[PDB]
PDB file of all heavy atoms in Angstrom:
ATOM      1  N   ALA A 166      12.848  43.437 -13.338  1.00  0.00           N
ATOM      2  CA  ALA A 166      11.584  42.589 -13.311  1.00  0.00           C
ATOM      3  C   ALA A 166      11.396  42.114 -11.996  1.00  0.00           C
ATOM      4  O   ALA A 166      10.223  42.214 -11.478  1.00  0.00           O
ATOM      5  CB  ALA A 166      11.819  41.360 -14.303  1.00  0.00           C
ATOM      6  N   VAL A 167      12.391  41.715 -11.156  1.00  0.00           N
ATOM      7  CA  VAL A 167      12.282  41.192  -9.888  1.00  0.00           C
ATOM      8  C   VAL A 167      11.892  42.261  -8.853  1.00  0.00           C
ATOM      9  O   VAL A 167      10.969  42.106  -8.081  1.00  0.00           O
ATOM     10  CB  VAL A 167      13.631  40.459  -9.358  1.00  0.00           C
ATOM     11  CG1 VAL A 167      13.716  40.291  -7.911  1.00  0.00           C
ATOM     12  CG2 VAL A 167      13.805  39.101 -10.238  1.00  0.00           C
ATOM     13  N   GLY A 168      12.674  43.399  -8.942  1.00  0.00           N
ATOM     14  CA  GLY A 168      12.207  44.599  -8.049  1.00  0.00           C
ATOM     15  C   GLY A 168      10.809  44.918  -8.254  1.00  0.00           C
ATOM     16  O   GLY A 168      10.168  45.212  -7.101  1.00  0.00           O
ATOM     17  N   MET A 169      10.269  45.118  -9.372  1.00  0.00           N
ATOM     18  CA  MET A 169       8.925  45.695  -9.693  1.00  0.00           C
ATOM     19  C   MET A 169       7.915  44.679  -9.402  1.00  0.00           C
ATOM     20  O   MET A 169       6.844  45.070  -8.883  1.00  0.00           O
ATOM     21  CB  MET A 169       8.813  46.119 -11.185  1.00  0.00           C
ATOM     22  CG  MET A 169       9.589  47.363 -11.493  1.00  0.00           C
ATOM     23  SD  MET A 169       9.399  48.757 -10.324  1.00  0.00           S
ATOM     24  CE  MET A 169       7.623  49.012 -10.285  1.00  0.00           C
ATOM     25  N   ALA A 170       8.269  43.425  -9.494  1.00  0.00           N
ATOM     26  CA  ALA A 170       7.412  42.250  -9.022  1.00  0.00           C
ATOM     27  C   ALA A 170       7.256  42.254  -7.410  1.00  0.00           C
ATOM     28  O   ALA A 170       6.176  42.179  -6.961  1.00  0.00           O
ATOM     29  CB  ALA A 170       7.894  40.882  -9.493  1.00  0.00           C
ATOM     30  N   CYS A 171       8.419  42.533  -6.813  1.00  0.00           N
ATOM     31  CA  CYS A 171       8.427  42.813  -5.297  1.00  0.00           C
ATOM     32  C   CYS A 171       7.491  43.940  -4.999  1.00  0.00           C
ATOM     33  O   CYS A 171       6.657  43.745  -4.088  1.00  0.00           O
ATOM     34  CB  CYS A 171       9.827  43.091  -4.757  1.00  0.00           C
ATOM     35  SG  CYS A 171      10.833  41.458  -4.882  1.00  0.00           S
ATOM     36  N   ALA A 172       7.640  45.130  -5.788  1.00  0.00           N
ATOM     37  CA  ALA A 172       7.017  46.373  -5.530  1.00  0.00           C
ATOM     38  C   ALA A 172       5.374  46.172  -5.641  1.00  0.00           C
ATOM     39  O   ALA A 172       4.738  46.558  -4.669  1.00  0.00           O
ATOM     40  CB  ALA A 172       7.510  47.381  -6.388  1.00  0.00           C
ATOM     41  N   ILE A 173       4.987  45.599  -6.716  1.00  0.00           N
ATOM     42  CA  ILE A 173       3.511  45.465  -7.078  1.00  0.00           C
ATOM     43  C   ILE A 173       2.837  44.521  -6.031  1.00  0.00           C
ATOM     44  O   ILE A 173       1.904  44.873  -5.450  1.00  0.00           O
ATOM     45  CB  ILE A 173       3.179  45.139  -8.499  1.00  0.00           C
ATOM     46  CG1 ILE A 173       1.760  45.097  -8.775  1.00  0.00           C
ATOM     47  CG2 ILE A 173       3.691  43.655  -8.790  1.00  0.00           C
ATOM     48  CD1 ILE A 173       1.116  46.481  -8.813  1.00  0.00           C
ATOM     49  N   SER A 174       3.548  43.518  -5.663  1.00  0.00           N
ATOM     50  CA  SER A 174       3.181  42.393  -4.720  1.00  0.00           C
ATOM     51  C   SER A 174       3.058  43.071  -3.302  1.00  0.00           C
ATOM     52  O   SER A 174       2.023  42.813  -2.665  1.00  0.00           O
ATOM     53  CB  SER A 174       4.078  41.320  -4.629  1.00  0.00           C
ATOM     54  OG  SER A 174       3.832  40.457  -5.884  1.00  0.00           O
ATOM     55  N   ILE A 175       4.026  43.873  -2.909  1.00  0.00           N
ATOM     56  CA  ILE A 175       3.986  44.605  -1.501  1.00  0.00           C
ATOM     57  C   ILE A 175       2.939  45.645  -1.546  1.00  0.00           C
ATOM     58  O   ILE A 175       2.114  45.787  -0.480  1.00  0.00           O
ATOM     59  CB  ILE A 175       5.396  45.211  -1.312  1.00  0.00           C
ATOM     60  CG1 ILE A 175       6.300  44.106  -0.928  1.00  0.00           C
ATOM     61  CG2 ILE A 175       5.335  46.387  -0.298  1.00  0.00           C
ATOM     62  CD1 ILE A 175       7.793  44.492  -0.826  1.00  0.00           C
ATOM     63  N   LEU A 176       2.612  46.479  -2.572  1.00  0.00           N
ATOM     64  CA  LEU A 176       1.561  47.524  -2.733  1.00  0.00           C
ATOM     65  C   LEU A 176       0.239  46.835  -2.342  1.00  0.00           C
ATOM     66  O   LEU A 176      -0.492  47.362  -1.625  1.00  0.00           O
ATOM     67  CB  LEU A 176       1.629  48.022  -4.121  1.00  0.00           C
ATOM     68  CG  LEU A 176       2.131  49.516  -4.296  1.00  0.00           C
ATOM     69  CD1 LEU A 176       1.885  49.883  -5.733  1.00  0.00           C
ATOM     70  CD2 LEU A 176       1.348  50.490  -3.262  1.00  0.00           C
ATOM     71  N   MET A 177      -0.029  45.669  -2.969  1.00  0.00           N
ATOM     72  CA  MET A 177      -1.407  45.032  -3.154  1.00  0.00           C
ATOM     73  C   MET A 177      -1.617  44.260  -1.844  1.00  0.00           C
ATOM     74  O   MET A 177      -2.838  43.897  -1.757  1.00  0.00           O
ATOM     75  CB  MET A 177      -1.427  44.301  -4.443  1.00  0.00           C
ATOM     76  CG  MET A 177      -1.402  45.202  -5.604  1.00  0.00           C
ATOM     77  SD  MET A 177      -2.089  44.523  -7.070  1.00  0.00           S
ATOM     78  CE  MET A 177      -3.801  44.368  -6.664  1.00  0.00           C
ATOM     79  N   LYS A 178      -0.688  43.900  -1.037  1.00  0.00           N
ATOM     80  CA  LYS A 178      -0.896  43.247   0.321  1.00  0.00           C
ATOM     81  C   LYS A 178      -0.942  44.331   1.274  1.00  0.00           C
ATOM     82  O   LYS A 178      -1.124  44.053   2.553  1.00  0.00           O
ATOM     83  CB  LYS A 178       0.258  42.332   0.579  1.00  0.00           C
ATOM     84  CG  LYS A 178       0.297  41.030  -0.190  1.00  0.00           C
ATOM     85  CD  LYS A 178       1.554  40.116   0.346  1.00  0.00           C
ATOM     86  CE  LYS A 178       1.052  39.079   1.321  1.00  0.00           C
ATOM     87  NZ  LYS A 178       0.531  37.937   0.496  1.00  0.00           N
ATOM     88  N   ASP A 179      -0.804  45.611   0.927  1.00  0.00           N
ATOM     89  CA  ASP A 179      -1.031  46.886   1.719  1.00  0.00           C
ATOM     90  C   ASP A 179      -0.194  46.761   2.865  1.00  0.00           C
ATOM     91  O   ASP A 179      -0.561  46.817   4.018  1.00  0.00           O
ATOM     92  CB  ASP A 179      -2.485  47.059   2.161  1.00  0.00           C
ATOM     93  CG  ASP A 179      -2.824  48.221   2.753  1.00  0.00           C
ATOM     94  OD1 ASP A 179      -2.458  49.274   2.395  1.00  0.00           O
ATOM     95  OD2 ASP A 179      -3.755  48.133   3.840  1.00  0.00           O
ATOM     96  N   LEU A 180       1.184  46.658   2.709  1.00  0.00           N
ATOM     97  CA  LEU A 180       2.291  46.453   3.781  1.00  0.00           C
ATOM     98  C   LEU A 180       2.897  47.745   4.121  1.00  0.00           C
ATOM     99  O   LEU A 180       3.341  47.860   5.285  1.00  0.00           O
ATOM    100  CB  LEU A 180       3.257  45.485   3.317  1.00  0.00           C
ATOM    101  CG  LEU A 180       2.791  43.989   2.922  1.00  0.00           C
ATOM    102  CD1 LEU A 180       3.924  43.184   2.734  1.00  0.00           C
ATOM    103  CD2 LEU A 180       1.906  43.519   4.013  1.00  0.00           C
ATOM    104  N   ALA A 181       2.812  48.782   3.288  1.00  0.00           N
ATOM    105  CA  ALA A 181       3.588  49.972   3.356  1.00  0.00           C
ATOM    106  C   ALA A 181       2.754  51.178   3.268  1.00  0.00           C
ATOM    107  O   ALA A 181       1.975  51.185   2.229  1.00  0.00           O
ATOM    108  CB  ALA A 181       4.749  49.970   2.258  1.00  0.00           C
ATOM    109  N   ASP A 182       2.909  52.162   4.203  1.00  0.00           N
ATOM    110  CA  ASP A 182       2.270  53.547   4.017  1.00  0.00           C
ATOM    111  C   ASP A 182       3.172  54.442   3.262  1.00  0.00           C
ATOM    112  O   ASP A 182       2.744  55.500   2.701  1.00  0.00           O
ATOM    113  CB  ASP A 182       1.893  54.038   5.289  1.00  0.00           C
ATOM    114  CG  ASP A 182       2.941  54.178   6.366  1.00  0.00           C
ATOM    115  OD1 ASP A 182       4.025  53.982   6.124  1.00  0.00           O
ATOM    116  OD2 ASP A 182       2.494  54.541   7.567  1.00  0.00           O
ATOM    117  N   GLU A 183       4.506  54.108   3.013  1.00  0.00           N
ATOM    118  CA  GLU A 183       5.434  54.797   2.105  1.00  0.00           C
ATOM    119  C   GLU A 183       6.262  53.723   1.524  1.00  0.00           C
ATOM    120  O   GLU A 183       6.839  52.792   2.211  1.00  0.00           O
ATOM    121  CB  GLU A 183       6.318  55.717   2.803  1.00  0.00           C
ATOM    122  CG  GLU A 183       7.255  56.625   1.844  1.00  0.00           C
ATOM    123  CD  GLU A 183       7.955  57.920   2.404  1.00  0.00           C
ATOM    124  OE1 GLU A 183       7.142  58.647   3.192  1.00  0.00           O
ATOM    125  OE2 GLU A 183       8.940  58.162   1.854  1.00  0.00           O
ATOM    126  N   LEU A 184       6.416  53.735   0.175  1.00  0.00           N
ATOM    127  CA  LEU A 184       7.138  52.844  -0.759  1.00  0.00           C
ATOM    128  C   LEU A 184       8.179  53.655  -1.561  1.00  0.00           C
ATOM    129  O   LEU A 184       7.797  54.603  -2.199  1.00  0.00           O
ATOM    130  CB  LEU A 184       6.170  52.061  -1.659  1.00  0.00           C
ATOM    131  CG  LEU A 184       7.020  51.160  -2.721  1.00  0.00           C
ATOM    132  CD1 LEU A 184       7.718  50.154  -1.887  1.00  0.00           C
ATOM    133  CD2 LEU A 184       6.003  50.522  -3.750  1.00  0.00           C
ATOM    134  N   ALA A 185       9.496  53.413  -1.325  1.00  0.00           N
ATOM    135  CA  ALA A 185      10.692  54.039  -2.074  1.00  0.00           C
ATOM    136  C   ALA A 185      11.288  53.050  -3.105  1.00  0.00           C
ATOM    137  O   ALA A 185      11.585  51.825  -2.644  1.00  0.00           O
ATOM    138  CB  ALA A 185      11.598  54.532  -1.169  1.00  0.00           C
ATOM    139  N   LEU A 186      11.454  53.499  -4.365  1.00  0.00           N
ATOM    140  CA  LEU A 186      12.192  52.661  -5.415  1.00  0.00           C
ATOM    141  C   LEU A 186      13.447  53.502  -5.665  1.00  0.00           C
ATOM    142  O   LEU A 186      13.512  54.677  -5.800  1.00  0.00           O
ATOM    143  CB  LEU A 186      11.282  52.572  -6.591  1.00  0.00           C
ATOM    144  CG  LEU A 186       9.874  52.140  -6.435  1.00  0.00           C
ATOM    145  CD1 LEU A 186       9.068  52.286  -7.864  1.00  0.00           C
ATOM    146  CD2 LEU A 186       9.854  50.769  -5.961  1.00  0.00           C
ATOM    147  N   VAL A 187      14.638  52.639  -5.807  1.00  0.00           N
ATOM    148  CA  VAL A 187      15.936  53.228  -5.995  1.00  0.00           C
ATOM    149  C   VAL A 187      16.607  52.343  -7.074  1.00  0.00           C
ATOM    150  O   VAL A 187      16.509  51.025  -7.022  1.00  0.00           O
ATOM    151  CB  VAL A 187      16.898  53.288  -4.837  1.00  0.00           C
ATOM    152  CG1 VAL A 187      18.187  53.787  -5.177  1.00  0.00           C
ATOM    153  CG2 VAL A 187      16.268  54.031  -3.643  1.00  0.00           C
ATOM    154  N   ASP A 188      17.150  53.070  -8.134  1.00  0.00           N
ATOM    155  CA  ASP A 188      17.994  52.568  -9.199  1.00  0.00           C
ATOM    156  C   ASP A 188      18.713  53.554  -9.946  1.00  0.00           C
ATOM    157  O   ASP A 188      18.443  54.666  -9.575  1.00  0.00           O
ATOM    158  CB  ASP A 188      17.127  51.580 -10.230  1.00  0.00           C
ATOM    159  CG  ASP A 188      17.893  50.390 -10.699  1.00  0.00           C
ATOM    160  OD1 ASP A 188      19.040  50.611 -11.062  1.00  0.00           O
ATOM    161  OD2 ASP A 188      17.283  49.403 -10.961  1.00  0.00           O
TER     162      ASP A 188
END
Side-chain angles (χ1 to χ4, degrees):
Chain A
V167 165
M169 287 314 300
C171 292
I173 189 67
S174 290
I175 282 170
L176 252 186
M177 293 204 67
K178 291 183 96 86
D179 186 43
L180 299 190
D182 59 2
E183 186 164 328
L184 176 66
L186 309 174
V187 179
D188 213 327

